[PDB]
Design a protein around this ligand. Sequence first.
Ligand SMILES: CCNC(=O)CCNC(=O)[C@H](O)C(C)(C)COP(=O)(O)OP(=O)(O)OC[C@H]1O[C@@H](n2cnc3c(N)ncnc32)[C@H](O)[C@@H]1OP(=O)(O)O
Ligand SMILES: O=C(O)CCC(=O)OP(=O)(O)O
Ligand SMILES: [Mg+2]
Lengths: 307, 393
Amino acid sequence: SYTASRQHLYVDKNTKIICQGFTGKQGTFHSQQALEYGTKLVGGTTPGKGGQTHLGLPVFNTVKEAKEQTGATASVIYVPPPFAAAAINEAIEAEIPLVVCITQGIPQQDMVRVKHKLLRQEKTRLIGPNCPGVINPGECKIGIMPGHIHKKGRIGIVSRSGTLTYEAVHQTTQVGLGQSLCVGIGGDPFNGTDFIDCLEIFLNDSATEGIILIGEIGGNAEENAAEFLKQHNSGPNSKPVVSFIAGLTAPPGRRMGHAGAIIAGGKGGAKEKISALQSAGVVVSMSPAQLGTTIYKEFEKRKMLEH
Amino acid sequence: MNLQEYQSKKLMSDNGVRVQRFFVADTANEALEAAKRLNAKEIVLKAQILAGGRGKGVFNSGLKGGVHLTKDPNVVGQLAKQMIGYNLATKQTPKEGVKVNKVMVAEALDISRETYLAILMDRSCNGPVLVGSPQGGVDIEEVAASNPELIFKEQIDIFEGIKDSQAQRMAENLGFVGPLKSQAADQITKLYNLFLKIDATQVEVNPFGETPEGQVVCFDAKINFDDNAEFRQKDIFAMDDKSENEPIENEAAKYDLKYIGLDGNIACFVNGAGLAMATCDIIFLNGGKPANFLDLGGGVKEAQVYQAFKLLTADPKVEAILVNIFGGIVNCAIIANGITKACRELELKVPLVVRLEGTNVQEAQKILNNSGLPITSAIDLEDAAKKAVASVA
Ligand SMILES: CCNC(=O)CCNC(=O)[C@H](O)C(C)(C)COP(=O)(O)OP(=O)(O)OC[C@H]1O[C@@H](n2cnc3c(N)ncnc32)[C@H](O)[C@@H]1OP(=O)(O)O
Ligand SMILES: O=C(O)CCC(=O)OP(=O)(O)O
Ligand SMILES: [Mg+2]
């Protein structure tokens, strides 16, 4: 089952990465950032430029070649919307263990076709599309997140919102807790990784001592996560979970940027998600600026800070 | 994206979906001739506006109602003269109403049975789902709350396509019997293939009905389109009717900007849909009212930033501007350059609170520090919200 690929989310210092769309504007800039961060970016693909050299690294026409020649176990996609679904499929077919798709704007119907293939295999784990990526601070950065705000630590972060991911990271760096692993699952309605996927990794990871879950209006993934936490994160040794759900004041019936962010037919509202998470013991920060302080205090109440 | 009734019904008809035979008219005389050319026992005349409630609307010509039935083509023309060129206002338009430039003239058909039939991309089901109920003519949300056992669904495999067995089963669950069942199943199939062809997120028919004469007809329908597929749906998006949209939102769209106007007085200039929603939330939390939602997307060009900022400075209600950028793919320096360029021409008679963090934040702060502009700096999101609310209180 595709759930067997969940472990591939936990990138580390040994993860070698290729960049699909390597020579494009954003693929170039964020590849530069990844190299400066110390990430083992070893090459990239751009159909028609195989054999060339870019940022001092080899360029390949296909993922299959790039994987065989470089030993990469992860790929990140900076391919424009008309072709990005095909780029994801190429990475799945090449059995890349982890694929991160940054691209915003892939047709929903395209992603339905990608998900169809994705769910019928388990060599490849997809994060995204329309997401910032995944980062293991100080070990492996795959995506667009600003490197300098991270600090290796104890909080696992999963968020549908890229920018709110950065807020959670910054706040948990500020209060000294740091981050174990940070996954932006993106704002699209059809994607490769949901809250439960990341929550499984977090609850089983000893380095993750607390969790921040950031959601928003639309869908029912937060409600599913609430039930998952009810059954797997109750009792004595539970890990504190803090959450913020964006859109409490959003107008109904409007797509709020993310196509996945809409209140339609009375479903997808923020208050229902907040209540579901609260019923599971999650502490919901009403302010998005207080995620760090809220989880710090939950660590304090449980005497989890060794001052 | 929005399509007039006559545009969507044409799209459905051109793809095999049975709708009421109809013509569209720009003049009362065209309405009269269309009525006579129909050669129909009874006729329906329908004002073409996007908002709902056309039936209970009122024109500034005195005519009550945007939908009229009659057997006489002469009445169709008499009524159309009071519609074309006039403003139709309903319970869902501004008080000034919407100018009606076109009317539909369609064959009126008796409805012996109403059902609900829709096709949508279902997030929970990871693909297209047929949704149907024999209880037609009412909001499906009500049927779901009153009689969930009457909501029937079929999950369609995106590669296999809809199977006859699925179309037949849904047709039966909707109460279609005998030859009407084969008719309904064929229409369900054509609706599904249309849904895929046009990159719809939803095609909703209500009522999906029978006539006394034994025809299955899509009497009314709403199509929601996937904006991400515009690049491969140029012909359909060309038909987009922006005449009833909020005007600032229309301007933003010209530059690929996602702007949603609100009722407050604190403008918001943010990157990311989540941070943008969260900024509205935190302003409310701290005693303010946001004037808009605004999501500056991924790779911003200075020109887009410049135009986006001007969209905030030209809303009469705006009494303060909150800039909150946490840049990853968004380059903070591009934001700074666009804002300062806009402020050089504006005048800026309102407080400007600026929170910048992330990609290239140092260069960005330098630009703002060299600008000579009256900027209130904020260190974090709560600080920015408190300073914004205080600046207009
Ligand atoms: C956090 C949410 N995400 C976002 O905000 C991301 C928003 N931005 C986007 O979605 C943008 O479309 C992307 C960042 C994906 C791309 O934008 P960008 O400005 O970098 O596009 P470019 O046109 O410069 O570069 C795309 C490259 O992909 C290449 N490419 C096209 N198809 C493929 C493919 N199948 N495999 C690999 N590379 C490909 C193109 O050749 C181009 O490279 P080139 O200029 O060397 O020929
Ligand atoms: O990296 C940036 O600058 C934007 C991040 C983003 O798009 O986030 P969100 O829209 O998913 O909330
Ligand atoms: Mg975004």
